[PDB]
Structures are given as structure tokens and as C-alpha cells.
Design a protein around this nucleic acid. Structure first.
Ligand SMILES: O=C(O)CCC(=O)C(=O)O
Ligand SMILES: [Mn+2]
Length: 204
DNA sequence: CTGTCATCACTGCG
DNA sequence: TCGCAGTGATGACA
């Protein structure tokens, strides 16, 4: 197993293909059968005073007794199911990092996406990495430095682009999430679904 | 309670 | 097809 070190100013991440094709295919099939995604209010978001559907399906799973916040609201993730525990255990066995929570984002095709953002670290264990595991269609992932955004950025730090492949793990390490925003842009030629699992270590 | 700060994804272009 | 510029109500925080 080979790791690519992704390095830039205030960016430290590591990328590998963690699951081979056969295993990744099995896992994808099981995620597609079993994951229960949000419906109703949790699948809506208000942006500049207009209501939209979240442009991807989402779900959370995690340890018993954990709660988290979604926009001021206190929520409980769903209990682990075996396929998710299988993924988590492989990530932990390889990296030595442990997680108690996962956010699942399912992009039905290239029109589902997520805009430039930094992960909310407020309820995360201090200094903890985030482990991003991907199954299904490859999708382009983009890191952009915080001071290189918008119309007249103060700095011209180069963007960092990579595809996240089927069965891959991207470890995003501190201080990546302080200095960089990441996104999964629209890619209209991608017709197939992708399921991404972002494992986190939440306080408690 | 107040006031600052960061934030989410769309439309309408080019 | 890609992606820029412009669009604010809301919650975190001190
Ligand atoms: O789908 C992805 O790889 C990114 C998801 C992500 O960054 C997030 O939900 O915080
Ligand atoms: Mn993220």
C-alpha cells in the first residue's frame, strides 16, 4: 500500500487506495442497499434567504450516546451497521486513528456536489484528523487556500486538485482545515453515483 | 441582549 | 461544460 503526501502551504493530507476493487465493489453494493438517508427538513437548506434541497443525500452514524449539532439543533446519529463498522475498522487498523462518527454524502451523479467549505471543528476533538473514504464514481476534489478565494484574493496560492477514486482514503490533517477550503465541484460528464464517508472524532 | 463573524447553494451570466 | 460574481438569515461567540 502506497501513500501520496499532499503538501502545500498549511496543507497536509495523505491519500491512498485503501480498498482493492473487489472489496470496494462489495462495500459499495452494501452501502447502496443499507444506508438510510435524510428526508424532510434535514434535506433542505436556506441560503441567502432562499430554500433549496441539499445537493446530495446525507446520513450520520456513530457510537451510542453521541449527539451532534446540525444548525443549532441537537441530533443523534444512527447506530452503526456492519458495513460501516467494517470500513471504520479497516481505517483504524491501518492508520491507528479512531473515529466515533461518520457523515455520509451520496452524490447521485456529477450534478450533486458540495461547495467550498471548511469542516466545523467546534465539536471535534482538538487536533483530530478527518478520514474521507470514497466508493463508486471517481470525483474531482479541490483544495483552495483561504486567502486565495473570491474576486480579489490577497494571495495567489495555487489550487490543489485530485480525483478521489473508488476505495480511496484521504486523511485530512491539521492545519489543512484551518487554512484551506475543500469542495467536490459539479462534473456533468459523471453519470454514476458516489458515496463518501467522512469519519470524525466528536467530543464525548 | 448586542454586535461581529462565518456561512450555505442557487441564478444569471460569459 | 465550467466556473465566476453576486445574492442574507442564522447561529456561534464574547
Ligand atoms: O464528498 C466529499 O468527498 C466531501 C464531503 C465533505 O467535505 C463534507 O461533507 O464535509
Ligand atoms: Mn468537508
Amino acid at each position: 500500500m502506497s501513500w501520496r503526501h499532499i503538501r502545500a502551504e498549511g496543507l497536509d493530507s495523505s491519500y491512498t487506495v485503501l480498498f482493492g476493487k473487489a472489496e470496494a465493489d462489495e462495500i459499495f453494493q452494501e452501502l447502496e442497499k443499507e444506508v438510510e438517508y435524510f428526508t424532510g427538513a434535514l434535506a433542505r437548506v436556506q441560503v441567502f434567504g432562499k430554500w433549496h434541497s441539499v445537493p446530495r443525500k446525507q446520513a450520520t452514524y456513530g457510537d451510542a450516546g453521541l449527539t451532534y449539532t446540525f444548525s443549532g439543533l441537537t441530533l443523534s446519529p444512527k447506530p452503526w451497521i456492519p458495513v460501516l463498522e467494517r470500513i471504520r475498522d479497516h481505517v483504524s487498523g491501518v492508520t491507528g486513528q479512531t473515529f466515533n462518527f461518520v457523515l455520509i454524502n451520496r452524490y447521485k451523479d456529477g450534478s450533486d456536489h458540495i461547495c467550498e467549505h471548511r469542516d466545523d471543528e467546534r465539536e471535534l476533538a482538538p487536533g483530530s484528523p478527518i478520514a474521507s473514504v470514497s466508493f463508486g464514481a471517481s470525483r474531482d476534489f479541490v483544495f483552495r487556500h483561504k486567502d486565495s478565494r473570491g474576486k480579489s484574493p490577497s494571495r495567489r496560492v495555487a489550487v490543489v486538485r485530485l480525483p478521489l477514486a473508488h476505495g480511496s482514503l484521504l486523511m485530512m490533517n491539521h492545519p489543512t482545515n484551518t487554512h484551506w477550503y475543500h469542495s467536490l465541484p459539479v462534473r456533468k460528464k459523471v453519470l454514476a453515483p458516489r458515496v463518501n464517508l467522512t469519519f470524525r472524532k466528536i467530543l464525548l
